[PDB]
Write a protein that binds this ligand. Structure first.
Ligand SMILES: *C(=N)[C@H](C[C@@H]1CCNC1=O)NC(=O)[C@H](CC(C)C)NC(=O)c1cc2c(OC)cccc2[nH]1
Ligand SMILES: *C(=N)[C@H](C[C@@H]1CCNC1=O)NC(=O)[C@H](CC(C)C)NC(=O)c1cc2c(OC)cccc2[nH]1
Lengths: 306, 306
């Protein structure tokens, strides 16, 4: 029993983090096989940062301008290339700890673990959601760039995120491991706006099912609703429209708890309209939206990895 | 910027988790050097837990009744002993992945990372506090006993917790790695009460300092108070009394934010008396008490380990 924001064990990723230095700037990179992946702004100087021409800054640099070290081991760089917003440095030695791995572009509302790193060394791990406006609510300081987010499916690490910037509002933005930003952001020292963020309805409902599985049941009611009528209440309170694909995803949970999806929608509707009344669900006074239905199912059925 | 409940990177601990089988029952153990540590109730049969005589169940068992598996490697058991509520299995081979480590008995209000495991393999990691009533608010299913809690200081893992039971109210209890329970709990299927749980006042203030560091400042006020006067407010509201030791520990944070401890107590008093008014602090509608002052400084100044 109990239910926590839980991250994936980070052993397989800690083994891949290295420090990458170019001139003054140091950040993190990801060492897999014979390639190190790192954010490309490692090649900026404190002036050229307000609008860099990265194709023309990469030209002033040769391999040996790139200092890569795994722990105290220095790696020899034997090639370098730019793909979108990441640099890829070919190194002489292939990471003996390379896990079996995939590169995956994640979808809004999906969750992943972040291993926050500084100077190539892990500091901590936490779970995160890719918000609908393509930001994440993380904990990142100077030097954190190159930190990666990931999921683990059995033995396979799915890398989905590399960290690149903090926006004005204090949320975070970054790329997939192909260097393509999530969202409309660019890697330049400019003030960029994220759009308005809705709440992930399908996740809030999966959390209500976790609550019920764990004994927390005061929010259950006698009522019902329809997908279209609840969706009017979702608009008003800034929740993503709920779809029949979402309904289908909540079904194994609906079928474990004996509570049909649309009656759980009805319980939610009434929490949105009247609030919680100073009570709590799974220890929270707010509606939590960073658990996918998969997360709820992993944590209530006990899925392992190694 | 940002602030999350972060766990320590779990790599050094994953290398130590193994499976321990005694008849029908399988749970987790901790392999360090040539010794495996696991909860002694691995030797109970599904009947005997209501009142076990552990010395007399442990006598019916020989080395070879204990099957240890580290991944797929079966370890040979060459000795066994009971120390308080933990079994110690002497195995022929020393764990090649043994980190530098100590066993530590932590104090109420200190935090630690939990690596939750099943069948000897890691499922996930989250951060936890030892409540004042010596329980923890975790996420543990059947098979999770033997999961351990730990802190990392640079290169040394400090093991502080091994998981043994869930109480009626759905909180959790366990031992230090010498097998002594935190709290008044015993390892038998009996009706056991956690005491009344107070809130960890020194941690709530540490979270308010974190909030201010990160821009959340709306709870700051013009008023002040005294140590004895706020403590009258802490009693009524179920908070542990604040001491000048606590003041002294909150001082480096008071000196980073330019806010003396007693002015921050004053902000808290009025949150306790008036609520939050539908607002949030660091994304929470509740007052968080599972960040120690140390945790706040680790996360706001970016401390690393590996
Ligand atoms: C990576 N090391 C760092 C991570 C930030 C540091 C502070 N918290 C983070 O998450 N990234 C950056 O510093 C990034 C570098 C560019 C060249 C890609 N810049 C920013 O992240 C940045 C610029 C900025 C402005 O205008 C300059 C205004 C508000 C916020 C902001 N953030
Ligand atoms: C260990 N593998 C397991 C962990 C539990 C499983 C369910 N959630 C957990 O945390 N421990 C036990 O099953 C433990 C066995 C020993 C201590 C004999 N028993 C309990 O944890 C337990 C007994 C109990 C009773 O019986 C009076 C009543 C309410 C709750 C409860 N929990």
């Amino acid at each position: 029993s109990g239910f926590r924001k839980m991250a994936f064990p980070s052993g397989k990723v800690e083994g891949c983090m290295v420090q990458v230095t170019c001139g003054t700037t140091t950040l993190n990179g990801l060492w897999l096989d014979d390639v190190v992946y790192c954010p490309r702004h490692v090649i900026c100087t404190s002036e050229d940062m307000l609008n860099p021409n990265y194709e023309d800054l990469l030209i002033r640099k040769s391999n040996h301008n790139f200092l890569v070290q795994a722990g105290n081991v220095q790696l020899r760089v034997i090639g370098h290339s730019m793909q979108n917003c990441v640099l890829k440095l070919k190194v002489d030695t292939a990471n003996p700890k390379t896990p079996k791995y995939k590169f995956v572009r994640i979808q809004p509302g999906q969750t992943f673990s972040v291993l926050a790193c500084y100077n190539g060394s892990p500091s901590g791990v936490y779970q995160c959601a890719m918000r609908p406006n393509f930001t994440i609510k993380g904990s990142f300081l100077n030097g954190s760039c190159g930190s990666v987010g990931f999921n683990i499916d059995y033995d396979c690490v799915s890398f989905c995120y590399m960290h690149h910037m903090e926006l004005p509002t204090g949320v975070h933005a970054g790329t997939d491991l192909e260097g393509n930003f999530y969202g409309p952001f660019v890697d330049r020292q400019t003030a960029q706006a994220a759009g308005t963020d809705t709440t992930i309805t399908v996740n809030v409902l999966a959390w209500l099912y976790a609550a019920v599985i764990n004994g927390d049941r005061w929010f259950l009611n006698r009522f019902t609703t329809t997908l279209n009528d609840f969706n009017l209440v979702a608009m008003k309170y800034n929740y993503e429209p709920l779809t029949q694909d979402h309904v289908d995803i909540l079904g194994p949970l609906s079928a474990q708890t004996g509570i049909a999806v649309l009656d759980m929608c009805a319980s939610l509707k009434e929490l949105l309209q009247n609030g919680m009344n100073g009570r709590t669900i799974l220890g929270s006074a707010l509606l939590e939206d960073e658990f996918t239905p998969f997360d709820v199912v992993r944590q209530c059925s006990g899925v392992t990895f190694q």
